[PDB]
Amino acid sequence: MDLKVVVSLSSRLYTDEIAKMQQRIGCILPLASTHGTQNVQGLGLGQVYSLETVPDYVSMYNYLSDCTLAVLDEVSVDSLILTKIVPGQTYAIKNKYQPFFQWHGTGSLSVMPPVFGREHATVKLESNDVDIVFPMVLPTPIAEEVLQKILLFNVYSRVVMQAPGNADMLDVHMHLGSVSYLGHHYELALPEVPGPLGLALLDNLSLYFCIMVTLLPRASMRLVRGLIRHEHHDLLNLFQEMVPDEIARIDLDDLSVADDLSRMRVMMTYLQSLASLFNLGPRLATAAYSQETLTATCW
Amino acid sequence: PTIAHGDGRRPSKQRTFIVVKNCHKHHISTEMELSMLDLEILHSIPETP
Amino acid sequence: MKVQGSVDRRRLQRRIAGLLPPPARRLNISRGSEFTRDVRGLVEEHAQASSLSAAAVWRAGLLAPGEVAVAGGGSGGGSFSWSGWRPPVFGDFLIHASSFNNAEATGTPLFQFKQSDPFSGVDAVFTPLSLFILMNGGLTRMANLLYDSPATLADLVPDFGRLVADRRFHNFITPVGPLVENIKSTYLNKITTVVHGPVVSKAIPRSTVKVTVPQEAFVDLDAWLSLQPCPADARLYVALTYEEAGPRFTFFQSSRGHCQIMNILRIYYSPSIMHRYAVVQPLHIEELTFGAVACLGTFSATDGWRRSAFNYRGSSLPVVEIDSFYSNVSDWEVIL
Numbered sequence A: 001m002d003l004k005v006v007v008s009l010s011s012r013l014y015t016d017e018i019a020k021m022q023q024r025i026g027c028i029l030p031l032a033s034t035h036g037t038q039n040v041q042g043l044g045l046g047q048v049y050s051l052e053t054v055p056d057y058v059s060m061y062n063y064l065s066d067c068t069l070a071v072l073d074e075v076s077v078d079s080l081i082l083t084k085i086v087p088g089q090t091y092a093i094k095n096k097y098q099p100f101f102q103w104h105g106t107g108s109l110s111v112m113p114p115v116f117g118r119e120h121a122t123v124k125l126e127s128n129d130v131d132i133v134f135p136m137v138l139p140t141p142i143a144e145e146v147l148q149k150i151l152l153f154n155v156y157s158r159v160v161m162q163a164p165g166n167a168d169m170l171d172v173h174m175h176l177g178s179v180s181y182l183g184h185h186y187e188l189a190l191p192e193v194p195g196p197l198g199l200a201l202l203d204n205l206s207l208y209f210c211i212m213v214t215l216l217p218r219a220s221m222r223l224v225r226g227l228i229r230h231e232h233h234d235l236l237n238l239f240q241e242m243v244p245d246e247i248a249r250i251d252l253d254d255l256s257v258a259d260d261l262s263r264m265r266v267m268m269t270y271l272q273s274l275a276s277l278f279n280l281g282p283r284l285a286t287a288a289y290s291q292e293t294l295t296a297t298c299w
Numbered sequence B: 001p002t003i004a005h006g007d008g009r010r011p012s013k014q015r016t017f018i019v020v021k022n023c024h025k026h027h028i029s030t031e032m033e034l035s036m037l038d039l040e041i042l043h044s045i046p047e048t049p
Numbered sequence C: 001m002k003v004q005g006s007v008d009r010r011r012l013q014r015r016i017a018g019l020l021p022p023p024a025r026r027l028n029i030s031r032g033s034e035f036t037r038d039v040r041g042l043v044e045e046h047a048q049a050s051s052l053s054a055a056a057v058w059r060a061g062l063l064a065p066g067e068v069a070v071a072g073g074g075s076g077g078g079s080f081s082w083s084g085w086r087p088p089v090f091g092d093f094l095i096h097a098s099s100f101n102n103a104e105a106t107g108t109p110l111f112q113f114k115q116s117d118p119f120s121g122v123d124a125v126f127t128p129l130s131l132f133i134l135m136n137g138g139l140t141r142m143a144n145l146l147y148d149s150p151a152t153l154a155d156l157v158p159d160f161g162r163l164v165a166d167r168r169f170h171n172f173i174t175p176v177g178p179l180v181e182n183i184k185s186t187y188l189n190k191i192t193t194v195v196h197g198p199v200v201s202k203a204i205p206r207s208t209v210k211v212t213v214p215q216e217a218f219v220d221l222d223a224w225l226s227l228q229p230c231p232a233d234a235r236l237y238v239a240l241t242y243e244e245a246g247p248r249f250t251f252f253q254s255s256r257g258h259c260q261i262m263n264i265l266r267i268y269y270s271p272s273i274m275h276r277y278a279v280v281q282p283l284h285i286e287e288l289t290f291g292a293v294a295c296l297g298t299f300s301a302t303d304g305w306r307r308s309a310f311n312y313r314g315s316s317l318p319v320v321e322i323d324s325f326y327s328n329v330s331d332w333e334v335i336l
Helices: A015-023 A057-066 A140-159 A172-176 A199-215 A218-229 A245-250 A257-278 B036-040 C009-019 C037-043 C056-060 C130-135 C139-146 C160-165 C258-268 C270-277
Strands: A005-008 A028-031 A068-075 A079-084 A091-094 A109-112 A122-125 A130-133 A136-139 A178-181 A184-187 A295-298 C089-096 C109-113 C124-126 C173-183 C188-195 C210-214 C218-220 C233-242 C247-254 C291-300 C305-311 C316-323 C333-335
Touching: A015 A068, A015 A122, A028 A079, A057 A109, A057 C258, A109 A140, A136 A140, A140 A172, A140 A178, A140 A199, A199 A257, A199 C258, A218 A245, A218 A257, A257 C258, A257 C333, C089 C124, C089 C173, C124 C130, C130 C139, C130 C247, C139 C316, C173 C291, C210 C305, C247 C258, C258 C270, C258 C291, C258 C333, C291 C316
Parallel strands: C218 C247
Antiparallel strands: A005 A079, A028 A068, A068 A079, A091 A295, A109 A136, A122 A130, A178 A184, C089 C188, C109 C124, C109 C173, C173 C188, C210 C316, C233 C247, C233 C291, C291 C333, C305 C316
């Protein structure tokens, strides 16, 4: 019923700063405690994104789902007033994130740790000796790509990790280093070395892939074997005329409809369970949007 | 104020200080719990003793 | 000279007057008052279950167009919600009286097995203890005192040998929700449980239902791992795990989140996966799957699960009871 949280600042914040925080109105940020009165220390994402310790995007991902969320309402010299986000309610939310993306009407939105930049998210509170690190929310289609770019950088910057040749920068930054949006290129903050929880998450992928690799239906491989040479397609430009050598090796046996039916069944249950792996964050659905008002109605 | 002196020292003219003090705001909260069975029987008139 | 030109303003004012007032909050306190009838208005909860008299229904307000009863006649109905309070949805079952033991705990979660015969009159429903007898001092003794003649369970499930070998047993079982009311009938019992809602009993002297699980099965996933956030909700899960000695049924509690919990389980079952995947078991197409995990509903974190005993014929079983459950069931997710 009465969902609100007031965060009392210990020391008065400066005049030049009250302008910065007010620009961030209607922006989600995660609270540690679901109680009516709180301190600043739990307010932002800054405890899990400390300047001293090395960043870990998955660690911030897990923290974002655990926390309760709130929308920023009012900024004063001494107090910030917010309203919590609860499952059975509707909220008027605003698009005020600095690397700008234009939301589609009636599309789900995804919340994510600050990936395009540490500087973009921070509003440094020099007075109270803290810094408030907002999360970043994007449309879900583009957030899924951002997640993949980060994961594939761990695995590839492990093999090619440091090569005196152009092996690195040949494709890793040319492919994974940046997301390109409509008429724009947004650079990504790629961590130099992943130590925690990034490799631990990819381990659970290779667990699925080593199960799934056995369950591949053979009728699928034999279809693509012919399509690459005989016909031409937009999708098949990836494979030049030459077929992969491994596909030529698995496809020795003749087809059987009885076998594939039991592979496509068992594989399907593993793909459904895959979807729960890639989430890693909370998502919000939208009902309306006004490019002149920049105010969606999330849910 | 100041004092008059006999030396040729550079004289401090009239001076004045202006200082500002501001308020601080404090908040207090608490939570109490009650069961629904308890709140519900506040609404209904009781039949028997 | 007063040209009628549209809907009269005065009539719409009366009709929007009723929709305007929202539910009341944020009342201010005066020790000079120290209490008010106004505070009662904010506090009262104003519930259902009238007395069946002709006016007692109207006084209580069960005849309300809303999903929840509100009194006051025309004056009532202004809240248009109760913080999203949703009435419970009930599920009625018709069960053999020999398959379900009457001395259950009214709050135990129930599981319905999907029969594979059409036009069937009676359902098949299993408690977490009956499931133990089926899939096969602690649990063993208390399960047997309740359910002797394990055949009366194995004939309800005639494919049990083939389903555990194909790793397909779990999808024919659907979680339903805790017992709420049980009628004792000598041949065919009428069992009622709550599917998707705040689990509250229908007893007329109003009482509190708290869902129970045998402590041998309950694994507190938090405190097994042992700033960090302290959220409000916590969730209860089940796991059906196909192992060597047989399928096993356990319960879990945590508040982390779905993507984390699936990871925690793959490291909680890492010894039992290896031991099964060891020389004991060979690769095959279907024998791969290890287990399935579903969520049964949320309850308040920071508290809300006690420990107690369940007595029957001079023997006790350690049991945990969760307070103020909210049933919300999802489908099974395969883990491996």
